[PDB]
């Protein structure tokens, strides 16, 4: 899934 520091 998406890493902590994504977006």
């Amino acid at each position: 899934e998406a890493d902590k520091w994504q977006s």
Partner: antibody
Amino acid sequence: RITLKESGPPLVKPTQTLTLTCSFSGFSLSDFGVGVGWIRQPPGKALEWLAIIYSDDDKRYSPSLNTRLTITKDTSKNQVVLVMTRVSPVDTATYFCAHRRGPTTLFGVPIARGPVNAMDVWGQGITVTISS
Amino acid sequence: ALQLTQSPSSLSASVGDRITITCRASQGVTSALAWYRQKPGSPPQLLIYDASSLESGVPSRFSGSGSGTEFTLTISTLRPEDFATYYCQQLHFYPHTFGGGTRVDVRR
């Protein structure tokens, strides 16, 4: 200066439980967005990511080892513990813990996330052999 | 899961050469990629973070470029301490994968 060091048993028998401790200095696991992860390296093989834990206490694990791993932190002792259950011979490897930076902040405002993209400081590694 | 393939897996070179190692991801990882150099008997050492930023204290002959699915590390003038194994690591998706490594040894 950030330094980390792994400790635990050098030898462990199959089916047993392995508890590894990462003791560090130079940062606190209460600092903003910081992480501490574990990576292993069987002799002669590639690095393999195992798990990581952040100061806000979010935890993530390798899907292949999820059922056998538990990672936890002890903020006041500056330690991160990784517990692996039911080990078998293929778990023999050198185990490293490592620091992961949190985003850079300016007057306590996150302004740069590029520094989180790497594990920047590593411990020397601890060699663990699994044999009965 | 996500696959990180390094090329070449092994590479021969001499002091003074320019080498470039490449790492390709099966799905885009944006710029969340790091390069490390690991000398025998030692832990990996961070060279480049966030695909192209030079880590503090790391010599300028090391350079990283690329984003998305293709990245490259180039060492412009190989020094003796660079005979080692290099790894790339993706940090966009969990688990945070490592490539298979590329061994750089003395050509003869």
